[PDB]
RNA sequence: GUCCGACUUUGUGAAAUGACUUGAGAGGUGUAGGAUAAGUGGGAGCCCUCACGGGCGCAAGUGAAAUACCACUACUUUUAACGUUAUUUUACUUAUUCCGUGGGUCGGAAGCGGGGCAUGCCCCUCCUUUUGGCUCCAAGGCCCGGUCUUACCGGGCCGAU
RNA sequence: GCCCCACGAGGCGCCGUCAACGAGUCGGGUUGUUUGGGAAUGCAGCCCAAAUCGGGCGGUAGACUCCGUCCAAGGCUAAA
RNA sequence: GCGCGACCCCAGGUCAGGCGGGACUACCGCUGAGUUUAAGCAUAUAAAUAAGCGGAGGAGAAGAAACUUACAAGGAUUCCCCUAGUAACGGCGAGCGAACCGGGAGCAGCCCAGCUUGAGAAUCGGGCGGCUGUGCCGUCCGAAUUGUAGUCUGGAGAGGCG
C-alpha cells in the first residue's frame, strides 16, 4: 500500500520525459465506450470457443464437402504482432493502454505510430482492453479492417484522437518538476495574500 | 523486434529520458521492499529472452539486492599479521563480479530452483539491483520442453556456486577466446602453475 | 533591409545564391564591377602562415584590367599587346605619387633598376609587384596575356580576409559558380599546417551595392 | 528562436549529423570525457559547443530513437 | 580508524554573479593627418533624381595607406532569444536521515461559543476557544434518545460536523 | 519379417529481396588483487560510457593510413 | 462496493512432487597464511600453496571462435611430447617464468534470442476416465499474448523457380 500510492505522486515530482505525460491526456469515456461497442462484433475467441470451432469446420468440410468459411475479421493483439502491423501500415487504428508496469514497453507505441503517421489513441485501462480479448493484458489491440456498416462510426474514432491532439508534439516538462503539493499550496496562498495586501496599500494611500 | 528493440536502446542511456525517470522511482520502492521480491513480469523482456525466457510454468524472475562498494576483510583495528603488502580492507576488491554474487545469494535461499542467468536492473548509491532467472527442474514443463531440458541434468545442479553461469564465466577471465585469455580457459589450475 | 534579410550562419549552396543568377538582382551598376569572394581564414600575421598564390581562373572575367607597367626596350613593346597605355620608366613617377588605379601591378626585370625608387609608396594599397607575388618575369608578353584573360593574385589581408575576383555580375550563372570553386581548392592547398579547424571557415559572396550571403 | 538562428527543419539536419560524427571519433581514438574538452575548441563553436555538452547530458534521445529505430526497421526490409 | 575534498547518491528553483551562442545597438580611441586612414571585399561609381543639379569619393592636404556605397570587421561597450554554462548563496517535499507509537483524535475548511482589530454591516485580511477544571472516585458495551426501511423479531442513519 | 513414412516436409541446383547477429555490456580511467605479460595478463569495485555498411582482435603507450582476422556480451554436448 | 474473465498482492498441517546433511580420494569454485628462501629483512620468495568455506558426478571442468596467425594460411575443447628450463619478469638480488606454432592421442557436432501461427495458443501443467504406460488418448478446469508452439543461429538462413 505504501509504495503504490507514492508512484503516481512522484511522476509529478520528477521531471517527466517528452514521451510520457503525452499519456495521462487520455481518450474520453464517451468515446471509449462506443469504441468497445464496435469491438463487441470483433471480439477474439475464448479457449472453449476456438476448440468448438474446429469441430464445426471439420464436420462441415468432410461430410458436406463445402468450400471453406469466409475470412475471419477480428482485432489483432499482442505487442510484437501489433507493432509489425504499424510498420506495414496494415493497422488503421490501434488502441493503446495507458498503464503497463514496464513503462519502457509502451512509450514506443504512440511514438512509432506518430512517426509513421498512422493514427493511434491512448485509452485508460489495460484490463479494459484485455476483457474484450478474454485474456489478461492485451496492451494493444487494433483494427486492420472494418466492416462497411461499422466504417461510418469508425471515422468518429479516427477524428477523436485529433480532437485532443490536433497539435504538434508537446514535449511536456522544459525543466519543471512538481505538480503542486498540499502543504506548499496552503503556504503559497498565505504568502501571496500578504504580498497582495502590502502592494495594494501602497497604491491606495 | 518491437518494443524489445526500443527498450534495449533506452537502457543504453541510463542517465536519460524514460530509462532514468521510471527506474529512479522504482529503485526507491525497492529500498522499502525486502531483498526477496519475486515478480511475475520481466523488467527487461528483451534481455530475459536473450538469456533464455519461455513464459510457461516453473519459470520465475526474481530480484536480488547486493550492496555497492569494495570489499570487507574481517577484524579491522586488529589488522592482519603479515608483511604490509597484504594490509588492506577497503583497498582490496572481490574478484567476483556482483552479477555472480547476486546469483550465489539467490541460489542459497532458493535451493529448490536453479539459476539460469541474471541481468542488471540498475543501482542507487549503496545497493545494486539485479533480476535473476531461475527455472525449476522439478516441474514437468521444463522436462517436456527440449530447449531447456539440458538444465535438468544433475551436472548443472548448483552451477552458480561453481561459477559456470554467464556471469561466472566473465569474472573467471573466459570473456576472451584465445591468446592473452589463454591462462584462464579450462582451468586456472589446469597446468597447476608447474 | 539589405542587412536584415540575409542569414550568415545558415549554409546556402553556390548554385542558389552568391555566385549565381541571383547575383544579377543585386547588380544595378552602370559599369561591370568585379565581384569578389571573402573567406575568413584562421590565420596569423606572418607571410608563411598567409594564403598567397596566383592562380589562373578557368573561365574568363570578360574584363580588360589595367595593370600599371612602366618598362623599357622590348619589354615595353610586349606591354602594348595586352595593356591600354604603354609607359616608359620616366612615367612611373605618376604611379609613385598618389595615382594607383589598377587591379595589380607588374614590372619587368629590365625595368627593375628604376622601380626601387617607387617602392615605399606602392606597398601601401598592397598592389605592389613582388617576386613573392610573381609579377616580375622576363616572359613579359606571356604574363600580360594571362592577367588580361583572368589571372588573379591572391593575398591574405591585415585582418585575415582572403580575396580574389570570381566573376563579374553580368556573366551567366554556370560560369560564376566554377570560378568560385577554383579559389576554394587553392585555399586548402596553400594553407599552413599550423592553422586550426577548417581553412575555409566561412565563405561569403557579395556585391558592392548588394549585401553578402554565406555560401559553403 | 535562436540556437544558431533561423529555421527548424533546415537546422535539425545539420545538427543531427554532427552528433554521431563526434561519437565515432571519440570511440575510435579512445579516452572519452577529457578528449571531448580538447575537441570542442578545435570545432566550429556555435551549435557545436552546446551539442557536444548535450552528449554528456542526454543529447535529445527519444527523438533520436524514433528516427534510428525507424531506420533500423528499414534495415530489415 | 579518523579527518578533509570530489564524484555517484540527487528530486525541485531562486537570484546573485562569471561566461558562450546568435540577434540588435551606442560607437570605432596606433605618427603626422580634425577624424571611421581602426580593417575588408569592392571601387568609377553609390544614392536622390534625373532638363538640371547634389551628399562621397572626384579634388584639397598628409603619408606606409585617403575617405562614397551595401553587408561586414578588432577594439571601447551593451541588450532580446532560447536558455546555455559555471561559481557560490537560499528556499520547498519526494530520495536519504532522525524520532515518535498496543501509526489516536493530524491537517484544511466549516459547525457551534466568543474576543480583539478601525470591533464600522458580521469583519473575513486575525487571536483564543470548540462536551473533561477545587474536590487519592470514576470516563469501558462506538448510548440513552431522535429518525427511516421494518408489525414485533431485526437492520441502517444520527446522537458524536 | 510387417507397415513405406511422398506427392508432405526437408536436402541439393539456380535466381532475388534481405540478412534481423544478445548493453552499464563494449571500451576507457582509477584503485586493489593477480599475471612472464612488460605506458596495465586476467580479474574485480567505483566512475564515465557506445554503435550496428557496425563491432572486437592484431604481446610497447599514441594519432594517421592500410592490410589481415573473427563475430562476443545466451545455451547444450561424448571421447581422449 | 460487489470490479464475471482478471488486474495486484496475501493464506492453507493445502494437491502431486522437490531442498538441507554426507562423501569430500579425485574434481569444480571461493577465500587465503606464515615458517622458509634471499645466509639479515620489507619488495619478492614460499604460493595465486597449506589451513578456512560450498557443490556435483563416475569422471568432473572445458567446448564449435568477437581464436591463432601473417601463411599455396592453421582451425571447438582436453591430455601427452616439445617449445622450456626458454621469450619475459626480478632489492635485474635470491629467484621467478608461460604460451603460440610443430608432432602425437582422441575426435562430433549443435539450438535458442533477434524477420510472420494471426485462418484464429496450433503449445503446456493439473484433475478425471480408459490404456499395453520414464509414456499415450478422450474429456473438463487452469496456465500463457509483458508471448507458448516455431522456420532459422552466422558455417548461415528466410523468398521464388525447377
Amino acid at each position: 500500500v505504501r509504495i503504490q500510492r507514492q508512484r503516481r505522486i512522484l511522476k509529478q515530482r520528477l521531471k517527466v520525459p517528452p514521451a510520457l505525460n503525452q499519456f495521462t491526456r487520455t481518450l474520453d469515456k464517451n468515446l471509449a465506450t462506443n469504441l468497445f461497442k464496435m469491438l463487441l462484433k470483433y471480439r477474439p475467441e475464448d479457449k472453449a470457443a476456438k476448440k468448438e470451432r474446429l469441430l464445426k469446420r471439420a464436420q462441415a468440410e468432410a461430410e458436406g464437402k463445402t468450400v471453406e468459411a469466409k475470412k475471419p475479421i477480428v482485432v489483432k493483439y499482442g505487442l510484437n504482432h501489433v507493432t509489425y502491423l504499424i510498420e506495414q501500415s496494415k493497422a488503421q487504428l490501434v488502441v493503446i493502454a495507458h498503464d503497463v508496469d514496464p513503462i519502457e514497453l509502451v512509450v514506443w507505441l504512440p511514438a512509432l505510430c506518430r512517426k509513421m503517421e498512422v493514427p493511434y489513441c491512448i485509452v485508460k485501462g489495460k484490463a479494459r482492453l484485455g476483457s474484450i480479448v478474454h485474456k489478461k493484458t492485451a496492451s494493444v489491440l487494433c483494427l486492420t479492417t472494418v466492416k462497411n456498416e461499422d466504417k461510418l462510426e469508425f471515422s468518429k474514432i479516427l477524428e477523436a484522437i485529433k480532437a485532443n491532439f490536433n497539435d504538434k508534439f508537446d514535449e511536456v516538462r522544459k525543466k519543471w518538476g512538481g505538480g503542486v503539493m498540499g502543504s506548499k499550496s496552503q503556504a503559497k496562498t498565505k504568502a501571496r495574500e500578504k504580498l497582495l495586501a502590502k502592494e495594494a496599500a501602497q497604491r491606495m494611500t | 523486434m518491437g518494443a524489445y528493440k526500443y527498450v534495449s536502446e533506452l537502457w543504453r542511456r541510463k542517465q536519460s529520458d524514460v530509462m532514468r525517470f521510471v527506474q529512479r522511482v522504482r529503485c526507491w520502492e525497492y529500498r522499502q521492499q525486502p531483498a526477496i521480491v519475486r515478480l511475475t513480469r520481466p523488467t527487461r523482456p528483451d534481455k530475459a529472452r536473450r538469456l533464455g525466457y519461455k513464459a510457461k510454468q516453473g519459470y520465475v524472475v526474481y530480484r536480488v539486492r547486493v550492496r555497492r562498494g569494495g570489499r570487507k576483510r574481517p577484524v579491522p583495528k586488529g589488522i592482519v599479521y603479515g608483511k604490509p603488502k597484504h594490509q588492506g580492507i577497503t583497498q582490496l576488491k572481490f574478484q567476483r563480479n556482483k552479477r555472480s554474487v547476486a546469483e550465489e545469494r539467490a541460489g542459497r535461499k532458493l535451493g529448490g530452483l536453479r539459476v539460469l542467468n541474471s541481468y542488471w536492473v540498475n543501482e542507487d548509491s549503496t545497493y545494486k539491483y539485479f533480476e535473476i532467472i531461475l527455472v525449476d527442474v522439478a516441474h514437468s514443463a521444463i522436462r517436456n520442453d527440449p530447449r531447456i531440458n539440458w538444465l535438468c541434468k544433475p551436472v548443472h545442479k548448483h552451477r552458480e556456486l561453481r561459477g559456470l553461469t554467464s556471469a561466472g564465466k566473465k569474472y573467471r577471465g573466459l570473456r576472451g577466446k584465445g591468446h592473452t585469455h589463454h591462462k584462464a580457459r579450462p582451468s586456472r589450475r589446469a597446468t597447476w602453475k608447474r | 533591409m539589405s542587412k536584415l534579410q540575409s542569414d550568415a550562419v545558415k549554409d546556402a549552396i553556390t548554385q542558389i545564391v552568391g555566385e549565381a543568377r541571383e547575383k544579377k538582382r543585386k547588380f544595378t551598376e552602370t559599369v561591370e564591377l568585379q565581384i569578389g569572394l571573402k573567406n575568413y581564414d584562421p590565420q596569423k600575421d606572418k607571410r608563411f602562415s598567409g594564403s598567397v598564390k596566383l592562380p589562373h581562373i578557368p573561365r574568363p572575367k570578360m574584363r580588360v584590367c589595367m595593370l600599371g607597367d612602366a618598362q623599357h626596350v622590348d619589354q615595353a613593346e610586349k606591354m602594348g599587346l595586352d595593356y591600354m597605355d604603354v609607359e616608359s620608366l620616366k612615367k612611373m613617377n605618376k604611379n609613385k605619387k598618389l595615382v594607383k588605379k589598377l587591379a595589380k601591378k607588374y614590372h619587368a626585370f629590365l625595368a627593375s633598376e628604376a622601380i626601387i625608387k617607387q617602392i615605399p609608396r606602392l606597398l601601401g594599397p598592397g598592389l605592389n609587384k613582388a617576386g613573392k607575388f610573381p609579377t616580375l618575369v622576363s616572359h613579359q608578353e606571356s604574363l600580360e596575356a594571362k592577367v588580361n584573360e583572368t589571372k588573379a593574385t591572391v593575398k591574405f589581408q591585415l585582418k585575415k580576409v582572403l580575396c580574389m575576383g570570381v566573376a563579374v555580375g553580368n556573366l551567366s550563372m554556370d560560369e560564376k559558380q566554377i570560378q568560385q570553386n577554383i579559389q576554394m581548392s587553392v585555399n586548402f592547398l596553400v594553407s599552413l599546417l599550423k592553422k586550426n579547424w577548417q581553412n575555409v571557415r566561412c565563405l561569403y559572396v557579395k556585391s558592392t551595392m548588394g549585401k553578402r550571403v554565406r555560401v559553403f | 528562436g535562436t540556437k544558431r538562428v533561423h529555421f527548424v527543419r533546415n537546422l535539425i539536419r545539420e545538427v543531427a549529423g554532427f552528433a554521431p560524427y563526434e561519437k565515432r571519433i571519440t570511440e575510435l581514438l579512445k579516452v572519452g570525457k577529457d578528449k571531448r574538452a580538447l575537441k570542442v575548441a578545435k570545432r566550429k563553436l556555435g551549435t557545436h559547443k552546446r551539442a557536444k555538452k548535450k552528449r554528456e547530458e542526454m543529447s535529445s534521445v527519444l527523438r533520436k530513437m524514433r528516427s534510428a529505430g525507424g531506420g533500423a526497421g528499414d534495415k530489415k526490409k
Side-chain angles (χ1 to χ4, degrees), chain B residues 63-77:
Chain B
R63 188 169 292 107
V64 197
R65 177 174 174 173
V66 179
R67 67 152 53 239
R68 281 170 41 92
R71 197 183 187 284
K72 294 173 182 176
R73 184 170 178 167
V75 202
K77 202 180 184 298

Side-chain angles (χ1 to χ4, degrees), chain B residues 48 51-52 59-60 114-119 131-135:
Chain B
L51 292 172
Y59 190 98
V60 293
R114 299 188 188 171
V115 181
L116 204 298
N117 284 325
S118 55
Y119 57 96
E131 280 194 308
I132 181 176
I133 302 172
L134 299 93
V135 195

Side-chain angles (χ1 to χ4, degrees), chain C residues 2-3 7 9 30-31 34 36 38 40 63 97 121 124 157 159 161 163 206-210 212:
Chain C
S2 293
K3 175 169 176 169
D7 185 8
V9 213
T30 197
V31 65
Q34 282 78 92
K38 292 183 176 297
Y40 191 36
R63 172 65 175 195
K97 186 180 177 181
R121 303 293 183 170
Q157 304 303 118
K159 290 188 177 170
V161 186
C163 53
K206 55 92 249 173
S207 293
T208 309
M209 280 182 48
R212 87 200 200 299

Side-chain angles (χ1 to χ4, degrees), chain A residues 137-155:
Chain A
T137 53
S139 301
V140 273
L141 47 74
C142 58
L143 284 161
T144 52
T145 187
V146 286
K147 303 176 184 178
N148 192 61
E149 55 186 300
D150 288 290
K151 197 172 183 179
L152 184 59
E153 55 264 61
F154 186 57
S155 304

Side-chain angles (χ1 to χ4, degrees), chain C residues 121-172:
Chain C
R121 303 293 183 170
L122 307 178
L123 285 163
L127 297 169
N128 197 41
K129 29 62 186 171
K132 295 175 60 59
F133 314 132
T135 41
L136 300 172
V137 202
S138 192
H139 298 77
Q140 220 295 119
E141 54 182 297
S142 189
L143 268 289
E144 290 295 295
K146 289 171 181 296
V147 294
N148 192 56
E149 186 62 61
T150 188
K151 192 172 182 177
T153 186
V154 172
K155 173 58 179 178
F156 76 115
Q157 304 303 118
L158 303 178
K159 290 188 177 170
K160 66 186 182 298
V161 186
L162 193 57
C163 53
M164 195 184 77
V166 283
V168 294
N170 301 96
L171 304 184
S172 57

Side-chain angles (χ1 to χ4, degrees), chain B residues 59 129 178 192:
Chain B
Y59 190 98
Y129 296 112
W192 205 344

